[PDB]
Coordinates of C-alpha atoms and ligand atoms in Angstrom, one line a residue:
Chain A
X3545 CA -0.1 -72.5 154.7
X3546 CA -2.2 -73.0 157.7
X3547 CA -2.8 -70.8 160.8
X3548 CA -1.1 -72.9 163.4
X3549 CA -2.3 -70.9 166.4
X3550 CA -5.9 -71.5 166.3
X3551 CA -8.3 -72.5 169.4
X3552 CA -10.8 -75.2 168.9
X3553 CA -9.4 -75.7 165.4
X3554 CA -11.9 -75.6 162.8
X3555 CA -13.1 -79.1 161.7
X3556 CA -13.1 -77.7 158.2
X3557 CA -9.8 -75.9 157.7
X3558 CA -8.0 -78.4 159.6
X3559 CA -9.5 -81.6 158.5
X3560 CA -8.4 -82.3 154.8
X3561 CA -9.8 -84.8 152.2
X3562 CA -7.1 -87.5 153.1
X3563 CA -6.4 -89.3 149.7
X3564 CA -6.2 -93.0 149.1
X3565 CA -2.8 -94.2 148.0
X3566 CA -1.0 -97.5 146.9
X3567 CA 0.8 -98.1 150.1
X3568 CA 3.0 -101.3 150.1
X3569 CA 1.6 -103.4 153.1
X3570 CA 5.2 -104.2 154.0
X3571 CA 5.9 -100.6 154.6
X3572 CA 3.0 -100.3 157.4
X3573 CA 3.4 -103.7 159.2
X3574 CA 4.8 -103.4 162.6
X3575 CA 4.2 -107.0 163.7
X3576 CA 3.4 -110.3 161.5
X3577 CA 2.5 -113.9 162.4
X3578 CA 1.7 -116.9 160.4
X3579 CA -0.4 -120.1 160.4
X3580 CA 0.0 -122.7 157.5
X3581 CA -2.6 -120.7 155.5
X3582 CA -2.8 -117.3 157.2
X3583 CA -0.7 -114.0 157.2
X3584 CA -1.8 -112.0 160.3
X3585 CA -0.6 -108.4 160.4
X3586 CA -0.6 -105.4 162.8
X3587 CA -0.5 -102.1 161.2
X3588 CA 1.6 -99.1 162.4
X3589 CA -1.8 -97.4 162.7
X3590 CA -5.6 -97.6 161.8
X3591 CA -5.9 -97.1 157.9
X3592 CA -9.1 -96.7 155.7
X3593 CA -8.5 -99.3 152.9
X3594 CA -10.5 -99.1 149.6
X3595 CA -8.6 -101.8 147.6
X3596 CA -6.0 -104.7 148.2
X3597 CA -3.9 -105.9 145.2
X3598 CA -2.0 -109.1 145.5
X3599 CA 1.0 -109.7 143.2
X3600 CA 2.1 -113.4 142.9
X3601 CA 5.8 -114.3 141.8
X3602 CA 8.0 -117.2 141.5
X3603 CA 4.8 -119.4 141.0
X3604 CA 5.0 -123.2 141.2
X3605 CA 2.3 -125.3 139.3
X3606 CA 2.1 -128.1 142.3
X3607 CA 0.2 -125.9 144.5
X3608 CA -1.5 -122.8 143.3
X3609 CA -4.0 -120.5 145.4
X3610 CA -7.6 -120.9 144.3
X3611 CA -9.2 -118.8 147.0
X3612 CA -8.1 -115.7 148.9
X3613 CA -9.9 -114.4 152.1
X3614 CA -9.5 -111.0 153.4
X3615 CA -10.4 -110.2 157.0
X3616 CA -9.8 -107.2 159.3
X3617 CA -10.5 -105.7 162.4
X3618 CA -9.8 -102.3 164.1
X3619 CA -8.8 -103.8 167.6
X3620 CA -5.9 -102.1 169.5
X3621 CA -3.5 -104.9 170.5
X3622 CA 0.0 -104.9 171.8
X3623 CA 1.0 -107.9 169.6
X3624 CA -0.7 -109.6 166.7
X3625 CA -0.2 -112.9 168.3
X3626 CA -3.1 -112.0 170.5
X3627 CA -5.4 -112.4 167.4
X3628 CA -3.6 -115.2 165.5
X3629 CA -6.0 -118.1 166.5
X3630 CA -9.0 -115.9 167.4
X3631 CA -11.3 -116.2 164.4
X3632 CA -14.4 -114.6 166.2
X3633 CA -12.6 -111.3 166.6
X3634 CA -12.1 -111.0 162.7
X3635 CA -14.6 -109.5 160.1
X3636 CA -14.6 -110.9 156.6
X3637 CA -14.1 -108.2 154.0
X3638 CA -14.0 -110.3 150.7
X3639 CA -13.6 -113.6 149.2
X3640 CA -11.7 -113.8 145.9
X3641 CA -11.4 -116.8 143.5
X3642 CA -8.3 -117.2 141.3
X3643 CA -7.8 -119.0 138.0
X3644 CA -4.8 -121.5 137.9
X3645 CA -1.4 -119.6 137.5
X3646 CA -3.1 -116.1 138.1
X3647 CA -0.3 -113.8 139.0
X3648 CA -2.2 -110.6 140.0
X3649 CA -5.4 -110.1 142.2
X3650 CA -7.4 -107.0 142.5
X3651 CA -9.8 -106.9 145.5
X3652 CA -12.0 -104.1 145.3
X3653 CA -14.0 -103.6 148.4
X3654 CA -17.6 -102.5 148.0
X3655 CA -17.1 -100.1 151.0
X3656 CA -13.8 -98.8 152.6
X3657 CA -12.8 -100.7 155.7
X3658 CA -11.2 -99.1 158.8
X3659 CA -8.4 -101.6 160.0
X3660 CA -5.5 -101.6 162.3
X3661 CA -5.0 -105.4 161.6
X3662 CA -5.3 -107.6 158.6
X3663 CA -5.5 -111.2 157.9
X3664 CA -4.9 -112.8 154.4
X3665 CA -6.0 -116.3 154.3
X3666 CA -5.0 -118.7 151.3
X3667 CA -8.1 -120.8 151.9
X3668 CA -8.2 -123.2 148.9
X3669 CA -5.8 -124.6 146.2
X3670 CA -5.5 -126.1 142.8
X3671 CA -3.0 -128.7 144.3
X3672 CA -1.4 -130.8 141.5
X3673 CA -1.1 -134.3 143.1
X3674 CA 2.3 -136.0 142.6
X3675 CA 4.2 -139.4 143.6
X3676 CA 5.2 -138.4 147.1
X3677 CA 5.9 -142.2 147.7
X3678 CA 9.3 -141.7 145.9
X3679 CA 12.1 -141.5 148.6
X3680 CA 12.8 -137.7 149.0
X3681 CA 16.4 -136.3 148.6
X3682 CA 18.0 -135.2 151.7
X3683 CA 18.7 -131.3 151.3
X3684 CA 22.0 -131.7 153.1
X3685 CA 23.9 -134.9 151.9
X3686 CA 21.7 -136.0 148.9
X3687 CA 20.9 -139.4 150.4
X3688 CA 17.5 -141.1 149.8
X3689 CA 15.1 -140.2 152.5
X3690 CA 11.6 -142.2 153.2
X3691 CA 8.7 -139.7 153.1
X3692 CA 7.8 -141.2 156.5
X3693 CA 9.2 -140.1 159.0
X3694 CA 11.3 -137.8 156.6
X3695 CA 14.4 -137.9 158.6
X3696 CA 17.7 -138.7 156.6
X3697 CA 19.2 -142.0 158.2
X3698 CA 22.7 -140.7 157.0
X3699 CA 22.9 -137.2 158.6
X3700 CA 19.8 -136.8 160.7
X3701 CA 18.3 -133.9 158.5
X3702 CA 14.6 -133.5 158.5
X3703 CA 13.5 -133.0 154.8
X3704 CA 10.3 -131.2 155.8
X3705 CA 11.9 -128.3 157.6
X3706 CA 11.5 -124.8 156.4
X3707 CA 14.3 -123.9 153.8
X3708 CA 14.3 -120.3 155.3
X3709 CA 14.1 -120.7 159.1
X3710 CA 14.5 -124.6 159.7
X3711 CA 11.5 -125.0 161.7
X3712 CA 9.6 -128.2 161.4
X3713 CA 5.6 -128.3 161.3
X3714 CA 4.5 -131.3 163.4
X3715 CA 0.9 -131.3 162.3
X3716 CA 1.5 -130.6 158.5
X3717 CA 4.5 -131.9 156.5
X3718 CA 3.8 -130.0 153.4
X3719 CA 2.1 -126.7 154.7
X3720 CA 1.6 -123.8 152.2
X3721 CA 3.1 -121.2 154.5
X3722 CA 5.6 -121.9 157.2
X3723 CA 3.8 -121.2 160.4
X3724 CA 7.0 -119.8 162.1
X3725 CA 8.3 -117.4 159.3
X3726 CA 5.6 -117.4 156.7
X3727 CA 8.1 -118.8 153.9
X3728 CA 6.1 -120.2 151.1
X3729 CA 8.0 -122.5 148.6
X3730 CA 5.1 -122.3 146.0
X3731 CA 5.0 -118.7 145.4
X3732 CA 6.2 -115.0 146.7
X3733 CA 3.3 -112.7 147.7
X3734 CA 3.4 -108.8 147.5
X3735 CA 0.5 -106.8 148.9
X3736 CA -0.2 -103.3 147.8
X3737 CA -3.0 -101.6 150.0
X3738 CA -4.9 -98.5 148.2
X3739 CA -5.6 -97.1 151.6
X3740 CA -4.8 -93.9 153.7
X3741 CA -3.4 -93.1 157.2
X3742 CA -6.8 -92.2 158.9
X3743 CA -6.4 -92.9 162.6
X3744 CA -9.5 -94.6 164.4
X3745 CA -10.5 -95.9 167.7
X3746 CA -11.5 -99.7 168.5
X3747 CA -15.3 -100.5 168.6
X3748 CA -16.9 -100.5 172.2
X3749 CA -18.4 -103.8 173.4
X3750 CA -20.1 -103.8 177.0
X3751 CA -19.1 -101.4 179.9
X3752 CA -15.6 -103.1 180.0
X3753 CA -14.9 -101.3 176.6
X3754 CA -17.2 -98.2 177.5
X3755 CA -15.6 -97.5 180.7
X3756 CA -12.1 -98.3 179.0
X3757 CA -13.2 -95.9 176.0
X3758 CA -14.2 -93.1 178.5
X3759 CA -10.8 -93.2 180.2
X3760 CA -9.0 -93.3 176.9
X3761 CA -11.0 -90.1 175.8
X3762 CA -10.2 -88.4 179.2
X3763 CA -6.5 -89.2 178.7
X3764 CA -6.5 -87.9 175.1
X3765 CA -8.3 -84.7 176.4
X3766 CA -5.5 -84.2 179.1
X3767 CA -2.9 -84.7 176.2
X3768 CA -4.7 -82.1 174.1
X3769 CA -4.6 -79.6 177.0
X3770 CA -0.9 -80.1 177.3
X3771 CA -0.3 -79.6 173.6
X3772 CA -2.6 -76.8 173.8
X3773 CA -0.4 -74.9 176.4
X3774 CA 2.7 -75.5 174.2
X3775 CA 1.2 -74.0 171.0
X3776 CA -0.3 -71.1 172.8
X3777 CA 3.0 -70.7 174.8
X3778 CA 4.7 -69.9 171.7
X3779 CA 2.2 -67.1 170.9
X3780 CA 4.0 -64.7 173.4
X3781 CA 7.3 -65.3 171.9
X3782 CA 5.9 -65.0 168.3
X3783 CA 4.3 -61.6 169.3
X3784 CA 7.8 -60.6 170.5
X3785 CA 9.5 -61.6 167.1
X3786 CA 6.9 -59.5 165.4
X3787 CA 7.4 -56.5 167.3
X3788 CA 11.2 -56.8 166.9
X3789 CA 10.8 -57.2 162.9
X3790 CA 8.4 -54.4 162.9
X3791 CA 11.1 -52.3 164.4
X3792 CA 13.1 -53.1 161.1
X3793 CA 16.4 -52.3 162.7
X3794 CA 19.5 -53.0 160.6
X3795 CA 21.1 -55.6 162.7
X3796 CA 24.2 -56.5 160.8
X3797 CA 24.6 -60.4 160.4
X3798 CA 26.3 -61.4 163.7
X3799 CA 29.3 -64.0 163.3
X3800 CA 28.4 -66.4 166.2
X3801 CA 31.2 -68.5 167.2
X3802 CA 29.0 -71.5 167.1
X3803 CA 28.6 -72.5 163.4
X3804 CA 27.3 -76.0 164.1
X3805 CA 23.9 -75.0 162.7
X3806 CA 23.6 -75.2 158.9
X3807 CA 23.4 -71.3 158.4
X3808 CA 23.7 -70.5 154.6
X3809 CA 25.0 -67.0 153.6
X3810 CA 21.6 -66.1 152.3
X3811 CA 20.0 -67.5 155.5
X3812 CA 22.5 -65.5 157.7
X3813 CA 21.5 -62.5 155.5
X3814 CA 17.9 -62.9 156.3
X3815 CA 17.0 -61.1 159.4
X3816 CA 17.5 -63.3 162.5
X3817 CA 14.2 -62.0 164.1
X3818 CA 12.8 -62.9 160.7
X3819 CA 14.6 -66.3 161.0
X3820 CA 13.6 -66.6 164.7
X3821 CA 9.9 -66.0 163.8
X3822 CA 10.0 -68.5 160.8
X3823 CA 11.7 -71.1 163.3
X3824 CA 9.1 -70.4 166.0
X3825 CA 5.8 -70.5 163.9
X3826 CA 6.6 -72.6 160.8
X3827 CA 8.6 -74.9 163.0
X3828 CA 7.5 -75.1 166.6
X3829 CA 3.9 -73.7 166.4
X3830 CA 3.2 -75.9 163.3
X3831 CA 4.5 -78.8 165.0
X3832 CA 2.6 -78.2 168.3
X3833 CA -0.4 -77.4 166.2
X3834 CA -0.1 -80.7 164.2
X3835 CA 0.1 -82.7 167.2
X3836 CA -2.9 -80.9 168.8
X3837 CA -4.9 -81.5 165.6
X3838 CA -4.1 -85.1 165.6
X3839 CA -5.1 -85.5 169.3
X3840 CA -8.3 -83.6 168.6
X3841 CA -9.2 -85.8 165.6
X3842 CA -8.6 -88.9 167.8
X3843 CA -10.7 -87.6 170.6
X3844 CA -13.5 -86.6 168.1
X3845 CA -13.4 -90.3 167.0
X3846 CA -13.4 -91.7 170.4
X3847 CA -16.3 -89.5 171.3
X3848 CA -18.3 -90.3 168.2
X3849 CA -17.8 -94.1 168.7
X3850 CA -18.8 -93.5 172.4
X3851 CA -21.8 -91.5 171.2
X3852 CA -22.8 -94.3 168.9
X3853 CA -22.6 -97.1 171.4
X3854 CA -24.6 -95.0 173.9
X3855 CA -27.3 -94.4 171.2
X3856 CA -27.4 -98.2 170.5
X3857 CA -27.8 -99.1 174.2
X3858 CA -30.6 -96.5 174.7
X3859 CA -32.0 -97.5 171.1
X3860 CA -32.3 -100.9 172.8
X3861 CA -33.3 -99.7 176.2
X3862 CA -36.2 -97.8 174.6
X3863 CA -37.5 -100.6 172.7
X3869 CA -37.4 -90.7 163.2
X3870 CA -37.4 -88.3 160.1
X3871 CA -36.9 -88.6 156.4
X3872 CA -34.1 -86.0 156.8
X3873 CA -32.4 -88.3 159.1
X3874 CA -29.1 -87.0 157.6
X3875 CA -29.7 -84.0 160.1
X3876 CA -29.2 -86.5 162.9
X3877 CA -26.0 -88.7 163.5
Chain B
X4210 CA -9.1 -63.8 194.4
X4211 CA -6.1 -61.7 195.7
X4212 CA -8.3 -58.8 196.6
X4213 CA -10.6 -60.8 198.6
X4214 CA -8.1 -63.1 200.2
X4215 CA -9.1 -61.7 203.5
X4216 CA -12.5 -63.1 205.0
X4217 CA -13.4 -59.5 205.6
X4218 CA -14.0 -58.6 202.1
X4219 CA -15.4 -62.1 201.4
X4220 CA -18.1 -61.3 204.1
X4221 CA -18.6 -57.9 202.7
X4222 CA -19.3 -59.3 199.2
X4223 CA -21.4 -62.1 200.6
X4224 CA -23.5 -59.4 202.2
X4225 CA -24.0 -57.6 199.0
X4226 CA -25.4 -60.8 197.4
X4227 CA -22.3 -62.2 195.4
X4228 CA -23.2 -65.8 196.5
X4229 CA -26.6 -65.9 194.6
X4230 CA -24.8 -64.3 191.8
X4231 CA -22.1 -66.8 191.4
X4232 CA -24.7 -69.5 192.1
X4233 CA -26.7 -68.4 189.2
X4234 CA -23.7 -68.0 186.9
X4235 CA -22.6 -71.7 187.8
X4236 CA -26.2 -72.9 186.9
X4237 CA -26.2 -70.9 183.7
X4238 CA -22.9 -72.3 182.6
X4239 CA -23.8 -75.9 183.4
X4240 CA -26.9 -75.4 181.5
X4241 CA -25.1 -73.9 178.5
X4242 CA -22.9 -77.2 178.7
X4243 CA -26.0 -79.3 178.9
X4244 CA -27.4 -77.5 175.9
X4245 CA -24.1 -78.1 174.1
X4246 CA -24.1 -81.8 175.3
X4247 CA -27.2 -82.5 173.3
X4248 CA -25.8 -80.2 170.3
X4249 CA -22.8 -81.0 168.3
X4250 CA -19.7 -82.8 169.8
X4251 CA -17.5 -79.5 169.9
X4252 CA -14.3 -80.4 171.7
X4253 CA -12.9 -77.5 173.8
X4254 CA -9.5 -77.5 175.5
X4255 CA -10.5 -74.8 178.1
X4256 CA -14.1 -76.1 178.2
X4257 CA -14.8 -75.5 181.9
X4258 CA -12.6 -72.9 182.8
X4259 CA -15.2 -70.6 183.6
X4260 CA -17.2 -73.0 185.3
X4261 CA -14.4 -74.3 187.5
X4262 CA -13.3 -70.8 188.3
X4263 CA -16.8 -69.8 189.4
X4264 CA -17.0 -73.0 191.6
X4265 CA -13.6 -72.0 193.0
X4266 CA -14.8 -68.7 193.9
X4267 CA -17.8 -70.2 195.5
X4268 CA -15.7 -72.6 197.5
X4269 CA -13.5 -69.8 198.6
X4270 CA -16.4 -67.9 200.1
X4271 CA -18.1 -70.9 201.6
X4272 CA -14.6 -71.7 203.2
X4273 CA -15.6 -68.9 205.7
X4274 CA -17.8 -70.2 208.4
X4275 CA -20.4 -67.3 209.0
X4276 CA -21.1 -67.2 205.2
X4277 CA -21.7 -71.0 205.2
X4278 CA -23.9 -70.8 208.1
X4279 CA -26.0 -68.0 206.6
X4280 CA -26.0 -69.4 203.1
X4281 CA -26.4 -73.1 203.4
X4282 CA -30.1 -73.4 202.9
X4283 CA -29.7 -71.0 199.9
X4284 CA -26.8 -72.6 198.4
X4285 CA -27.9 -76.3 198.8
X4286 CA -30.4 -76.2 195.9
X4287 CA -28.2 -74.6 193.5
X4288 CA -25.4 -77.0 194.4
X4289 CA -27.7 -79.9 194.2
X4290 CA -29.0 -78.8 190.7
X4291 CA -25.5 -78.1 189.4
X4292 CA -23.9 -81.4 190.6
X4293 CA -26.9 -83.3 189.1
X4294 CA -26.9 -81.6 185.7
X4295 CA -23.0 -82.1 185.6
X4296 CA -23.6 -85.9 186.2
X4297 CA -25.6 -86.1 183.1
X4298 CA -22.5 -84.9 181.0
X4299 CA -20.8 -87.8 179.3
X4300 CA -19.6 -86.9 176.1
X4301 CA -18.4 -83.2 176.9
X4302 CA -17.1 -84.2 180.3
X4303 CA -13.7 -82.5 180.4
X4304 CA -11.0 -82.9 183.2
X4305 CA -12.1 -79.4 184.4
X4306 CA -15.6 -80.3 184.4
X4307 CA -14.6 -83.5 186.5
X4308 CA -12.8 -81.0 189.0
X4309 CA -15.9 -78.8 189.2
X4310 CA -18.1 -81.8 189.9
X4311 CA -15.8 -82.9 192.6
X4312 CA -15.7 -79.4 194.1
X4313 CA -19.6 -79.3 194.1
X4314 CA -19.7 -82.7 195.7
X4315 CA -17.3 -81.6 198.5
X4316 CA -19.3 -78.3 199.0
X4317 CA -22.6 -80.3 199.1
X4318 CA -21.1 -82.8 201.7
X4319 CA -20.0 -79.8 203.6
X4320 CA -23.4 -78.2 203.4
Chain C
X3213 CA -40.6 -112.8 129.7
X3214 CA -40.6 -112.2 133.5
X3215 CA -39.9 -115.8 134.1
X3216 CA -37.0 -115.9 131.8
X3217 CA -35.5 -112.9 133.2
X3218 CA -35.8 -114.5 136.7
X3219 CA -34.0 -117.4 135.2
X3220 CA -31.2 -115.1 134.0
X3221 CA -31.1 -113.5 137.4
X3222 CA -30.4 -117.1 138.9
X3223 CA -26.6 -117.3 139.3
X3224 CA -27.0 -121.0 140.2
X3225 CA -27.6 -121.3 136.4
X3226 CA -24.3 -120.4 134.7
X3227 CA -25.1 -122.4 131.4
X3228 CA -29.0 -122.6 131.7
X3229 CA -28.9 -118.8 131.8
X3230 CA -27.3 -118.8 128.4
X3231 CA -30.0 -121.0 127.0
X3232 CA -32.8 -118.8 128.7
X3233 CA -30.9 -115.5 127.5
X3234 CA -31.3 -116.9 123.8
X3235 CA -34.9 -117.8 124.3
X3236 CA -35.7 -114.5 126.2
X3237 CA -34.2 -112.3 123.2
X3238 CA -36.1 -114.7 120.9
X3239 CA -39.5 -113.9 122.5
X3240 CA -38.7 -110.4 122.6
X3241 CA -37.8 -110.4 118.9
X3242 CA -35.3 -107.3 119.2
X3243 CA -31.8 -107.2 121.1
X3244 CA -32.4 -103.5 121.9
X3245 CA -35.8 -104.6 123.5
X3246 CA -34.3 -107.7 125.0
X3247 CA -31.9 -105.5 126.7
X3248 CA -34.5 -102.9 127.8
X3249 CA -36.6 -105.6 129.6
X3250 CA -33.6 -107.5 131.1
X3251 CA -32.2 -103.9 132.4
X3252 CA -35.5 -103.1 133.6
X3253 CA -36.1 -106.4 135.5
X3254 CA -32.6 -106.2 137.0
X3255 CA -33.2 -102.6 138.3
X3256 CA -36.6 -103.5 139.6
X3257 CA -35.3 -106.8 141.5
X3258 CA -32.2 -104.8 143.0
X3259 CA -34.6 -101.8 144.0
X3260 CA -37.0 -104.3 145.9
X3261 CA -34.0 -105.8 147.4
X3262 CA -32.8 -102.5 148.9
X3263 CA -36.4 -101.7 149.9
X3264 CA -36.8 -104.9 151.8
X3265 CA -33.1 -104.9 153.2
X3266 CA -34.0 -101.5 154.7
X3267 CA -37.4 -102.7 155.8
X3268 CA -35.7 -105.5 157.9
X3269 CA -33.2 -103.2 159.4
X3270 CA -35.8 -100.5 160.2
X3271 CA -35.8 -97.9 157.4
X3272 CA -39.3 -98.1 156.3
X3273 CA -40.8 -96.7 153.1
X3274 CA -43.9 -95.3 154.2
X3275 CA -46.0 -93.1 151.6
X3276 CA -42.6 -92.6 149.6
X3277 CA -41.0 -91.2 152.9
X3278 CA -38.2 -92.9 154.7
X3279 CA -38.8 -93.3 158.6
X3280 CA -36.0 -94.6 160.7
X3281 CA -37.5 -96.1 163.9
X3282 CA -34.1 -97.3 164.7
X3283 CA -31.3 -94.8 164.9
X3284 CA -27.4 -95.0 165.5
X3285 CA -25.8 -96.4 162.2
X3286 CA -26.4 -99.3 159.9
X3287 CA -24.2 -102.5 160.0
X3288 CA -21.2 -102.6 157.7
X3289 CA -22.6 -105.9 156.1
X3290 CA -25.8 -104.1 155.4
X3291 CA -23.9 -101.3 153.8
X3292 CA -22.0 -104.1 151.8
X3293 CA -25.1 -105.6 150.4
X3294 CA -26.5 -102.2 149.8
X3295 CA -23.3 -101.1 147.8
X3296 CA -23.4 -104.5 145.9
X3297 CA -26.9 -103.6 144.5
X3298 CA -26.3 -100.1 144.2
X3299 CA -23.2 -100.6 142.1
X3300 CA -25.4 -103.1 140.0
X3301 CA -28.0 -100.3 139.3
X3302 CA -24.9 -97.8 138.6
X3303 CA -23.3 -100.2 136.1
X3304 CA -26.8 -100.6 134.4
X3305 CA -27.4 -96.8 134.5
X3306 CA -24.1 -95.8 133.2
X3307 CA -23.5 -98.5 130.7
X3308 CA -27.3 -98.0 129.5
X3309 CA -28.8 -94.8 130.7
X3310 CA -32.3 -94.7 128.9
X3311 CA -33.3 -98.1 130.8
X3312 CA -32.7 -96.5 134.1
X3313 CA -34.5 -93.2 133.2
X3314 CA -37.7 -95.1 131.9
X3315 CA -37.6 -97.6 134.9
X3316 CA -37.7 -94.5 137.3
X3317 CA -40.6 -92.7 135.1
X3318 CA -42.3 -96.1 135.6
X3319 CA -41.5 -96.3 139.5
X3320 CA -41.2 -92.6 140.5
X3321 CA -40.7 -93.6 144.1
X3322 CA -37.4 -95.3 143.2
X3323 CA -35.9 -91.9 142.5
Chain D
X3767 CA 36.9 -53.5 134.1
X3768 CA 35.4 -51.1 136.6
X3769 CA 32.7 -49.9 134.2
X3770 CA 31.9 -53.4 133.6
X3771 CA 31.5 -54.1 137.4
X3772 CA 29.5 -51.1 137.9
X3773 CA 27.1 -52.0 135.3
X3774 CA 26.8 -55.4 136.9
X3775 CA 25.8 -53.7 140.2
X3776 CA 23.5 -51.2 138.5
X3777 CA 22.2 -54.2 136.4
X3778 CA 21.2 -55.9 139.8
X3779 CA 19.4 -52.6 140.8
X3780 CA 16.3 -53.2 138.8
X3781 CA 16.0 -56.8 140.2
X3782 CA 16.2 -55.6 143.7
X3783 CA 13.5 -52.9 143.0
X3784 CA 11.0 -55.7 141.6
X3785 CA 11.8 -57.9 144.4
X3786 CA 11.1 -55.3 146.9
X3787 CA 7.7 -54.1 145.3
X3788 CA 6.7 -58.0 145.5
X3789 CA 7.7 -58.0 149.2
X3790 CA 6.0 -54.5 149.5
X3791 CA 2.6 -56.3 148.3
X3792 CA 3.1 -58.4 151.5
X3793 CA 1.1 -61.1 149.6
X3794 CA 1.0 -64.5 151.4
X3795 CA 3.2 -66.7 149.0
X3796 CA 2.2 -70.1 150.5
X3797 CA 5.4 -72.4 150.2
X3798 CA 5.3 -73.7 146.5
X3799 CA 6.3 -77.4 146.2
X3800 CA 9.8 -78.0 144.4
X3801 CA 8.2 -79.5 141.0
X3802 CA 11.7 -79.1 139.4
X3803 CA 15.1 -80.2 140.9
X3804 CA 15.0 -77.2 143.2
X3805 CA 17.4 -77.0 146.2
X3806 CA 16.1 -78.9 149.3
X3807 CA 16.0 -75.7 151.2
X3808 CA 15.2 -76.6 154.9
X3809 CA 11.7 -76.1 155.7
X3810 CA 12.7 -73.9 158.7
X3811 CA 14.6 -71.6 156.3
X3812 CA 12.1 -72.3 153.3
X3813 CA 9.6 -70.6 155.5
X3814 CA 11.1 -67.1 154.7
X3815 CA 9.1 -65.5 151.8
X3816 CA 10.6 -66.7 148.4
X3817 CA 10.4 -62.9 147.5
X3818 CA 12.5 -62.1 150.7
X3819 CA 14.8 -65.3 150.1
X3820 CA 15.7 -64.0 146.4
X3821 CA 16.1 -60.5 147.7
Ligands
LIG4401 ZN1 -11.2 -73.6 160.1
LIG4402 ZN1 21.3 -136.3 155.0
LIG4403 ZN1 10.0 -120.9 158.2

């Protein structure tokens, strides 16, 4: 399909129109932490997200979500816990209101967001008040338990423990989410992100990030140099395979003792030089070129972010044209 | 580089005027990079191979004492201009560009 | 008519708007005309909103020419508000095309 | 039985000729996605022209 052995890969032929897709959030989460109202997630990589769909199952009428806030950022972090209690590091994408008992929410974003982390907050509720004064029943031995302190006098079981992970919240006896495992007794939540796997770099703030960003760019450029050598290293071998096939010699299929490789009769029939060329170019050259193109796109994003930061600093240091689309 | 590994032929070529030629080539390459620096952000894997190789040739010639003596005053200007113009590079700065700038700094300190 | 359209534009009035809507179409005398006036005011308001939002950011409409004293890129939230207003205008234009066409023949600059 | 097998062999002759023509064209047959339940031919092998493959 593509010409895998190309210097300075064209930003047109190589870069495709990545399509948005109904990706399950569960399939791209690599780390997750919770508060009593928030699910904070690290994604496998940066994604451009246009829509978020929330499906709500097993809904209980005693406490129903009224408000969902969606937050994001594009910060590279080792673990999502670094962002869990850092509200100033999050950008608000959307607030949505739900009707009582609503089981599906579509969050259309006015502009696509670029995010490596998401935070979904259940910010308000249509809580239905009940008589909590009544002695609770012990989940282990069915004895009556006073709501305060909520410890069974017969077996010592705490009635406010999370049904899933047995953790106890000290500050909130009836949290919407378990802050340890995210369990919700009031509903089940599934998230479907209409997004795409478009990798991007974190924004730059101060020289700390500017020097850091430049170091990252240099490292990625060194990586591209290395993958460049691998891709062009196959070139000579590919030329050799080409010359050998051009000879068009009738090399009868050789019955190699090693049959571990899955070689079909038809494939064995296909010229080995032809097969060696197909493996070298479509396999090895294509893998190396894909790696190099990914590195080149990430380097371009880092350069573009660096360029924008420098322009902002100069724009402020200095203290244009209608056809400004020509610039930037 | 193999043919001029002897200082004999390095001095011969220096007498013919190879040093101003390589200096002008380095200046032109650095100016082309500067011209591209303000142009599109076109990433190049080998970006600076010609520059690095020309600077390596100039360093190889300078590594001979007599040529250094006779051409310090004539090479100081072009090395200063090249190093200053390379320091302006931020977005197009490639590892090879960094090595070239380091070599120019060493040559300037030596000059 | 303008005052009643501004009362409609007021989200703070979810029930008062309904009463004002009935009064506005009553003053108009025709639902078709009523819709035309309401759409024209909505488009005019969204257009001046965009104009002033770009004024404050630095995209200035001088003699129907956009001048960007500030370069770089626009804030994400500025793009968000821009997209809200432009989606409102797109909804007006696509749901009802004639209104938009006449609004822009009334205000050429908009186009 | 022999006339029958001969006819089989000579019956494959035309197919070989057409496949050879399509190979002679040296046209780039960009790998076509398996819309139907086609064999999951390994990509490394699927690479070989489908004309060459059938041949
Ligand atoms: Zn191209
Ligand atoms: Zn108990
Ligand atoms: Zn739990």
